[PDB]
Point group: C2
Chain length 310, copies 2
């Protein structure tokens, strides 16, 4: 089976295509190729500034008969600048994506910043070139407006992005609609066992963005540490006759954590989706568990002038 | 200038004695010796299980004329198991400490766990030996009850412990009484500049617990930069580390029983670091967290 049941009954594909940093012709080809290969889950966001292009690619695929809307699981996210404008931000995402509903809508960060206009998300700086962090809209107020997007019928499922244990426990304690999903960076070098286990205990599906850590299949410069170069994963890739990326992705799937790897290259798109077609043995899961480095690789731009993980 | 003005007008001594892991005769003597040397700020907590002994030492000090209550700044904290029983927990701390009011009352962690009885705080475990974390009381509900301890006259100033940027921004956005203080681990190997600056921007005084940092082991007091500055200023490395936090408006609560160390820590008020030397220390940040909850919780809250 290729899906996981969310706590409101909807089925979510456990492999999705992460769309962060895909643009223009590469974005169009990636989405079309992915749908042709069998991808049914696409992870977008307002602040990627690509929702119109994502919508155009999905529209082409539907109009060409490659897939039906109801077969797709489409996610977007409300940016930090719209924590006080959730419903209108949601309507704007739907307009740009050419959709009547979203399958999943996430709070992109547990952080409100100065509003910059609906549909024109931004990370505005103050007089000292420091992120203009808002201190008027609570995360709970934002969450209750996420609940409104559900009651309005704009969104089926709602959830969190980049929330950790304290913030997730807080959400559970004030939520009227419990989050369906909590998405955050996790992979074999940042395993976050306690956070994953806590989400699952309370019926929240944890979802791994950045599920390969720093890693890409490109030729690159020295000085970028990644779980895919770990000898443990290299050995397991040889054992299973899989790529190291496939081993890393399957490790998250084995613990009930869907993955949204990013890729435009058809060979790799195909390999990542074929993670559905093998299983890791128990002892090999336990071997991968030993290589955690507690190593965070997905960070906000230095241009914020604030380390939110300080 | 031995105090900093909180956003509600009360003065707080920038050097305090942290009482974590002091008990029995060591605790009583440390408090009496600290007061005699000039300490006026004492950082207690319900979950340290020592409030009765802390209160007895403070009472003895006042009774002997060493100090008056109004000259002392006393802090306690509500434990994770009491996030739904804040006023009861506060009155219990006041009873054990033999005080009529607290100067400062902190939420010990941004985490609620299963209630274990007022005055008998604990970190309870579920069926699989994992911390029994509560999902019914919000941090905002706890905060409004911290505000109620102020309304009732039990507490002058209220604040946060072990909250970081996302949680502190959230508190500021729903608080009716803005927190006076945010206390967290910070020292030259875990400088957290963005968090310190954010607190200060919004009128919250950041306060450094674990201000000296950390077989074998690791410590900022062993960094060649601090060792060199110690010789340059003719101070101890610990004094350099403490002064560095004081220089950026971040009070410190070092823990210590030995009179010689108590005295040296308080004399941090008697010298200043030059701008260029502060900048030298700023270069040695390691983002290195050393103060962690017990492994017996079975959960890494910083996961």
């Amino acid at each position: 089976m290729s899906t996981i049941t969310l706590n409101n009954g909807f089925e979510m594909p456990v492999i999705g295509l992460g769309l962060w940093r895909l643009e223009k012709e590469e974005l169009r080809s990636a989405i079309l190729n992915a749908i042709k290969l069998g991808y049914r889950h696409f992870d977008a966001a307002a602040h990627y500034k690509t929702e119109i292009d994502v919508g155009n690619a999905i529209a082409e695929a539907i109009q060409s008969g490659l897939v039906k809307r109801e077969e797709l699981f489409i996610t977007s996210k409300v940016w930090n600048s719209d924590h006080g404008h959730v419903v209108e931000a949601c309507k704007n995402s739907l307009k740009k994506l050419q959709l009547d509903y979203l399958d999943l809508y996430l709070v992109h960060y547990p952080l409100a910043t100065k509003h910059s206009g609906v549909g024109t998300t931004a990370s505005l700086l103050d007089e000292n070139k420091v992120l203009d962090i808002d201190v008027t809209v609570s995360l709970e107020t934002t969450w209750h407006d996420m609940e409104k997007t559900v009651s309005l019928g704009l969104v089926r499922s709602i959830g969190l992005s980049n929330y950790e244990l304290f913030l997730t426990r807080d959400c559970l304690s004030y939520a009227k609609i419990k989050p369906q999903v909590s998405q955050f960076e996790t992979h074999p070098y940042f395993q976050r066992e306690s956070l994953v286990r806590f989400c699952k205990k309370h019926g929240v599906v944890p979802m791994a963005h950045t599920p390969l850590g720093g890693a890409t299949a490109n030729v690159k410069a020295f000085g970028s540490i990644s779980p895919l170069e770990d000898p443990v994963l290299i050995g397991l890739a040889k054992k299973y006759q899989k790529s190291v990326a496939q081993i890393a992705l399957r490790w998250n799937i084995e613990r009930g954590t869907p993955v949204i790897p990013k890729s435009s290259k058809v060979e790799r798109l195909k390999e990542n989706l074929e993670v559905l077609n093998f299983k890791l043995e128990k002892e090999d899961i336990e071997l991968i568990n030993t290589i955690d480095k507690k190593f965070r690789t997905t960070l906000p731009s230095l241009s914020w002038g604030v380390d939110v993980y300080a």
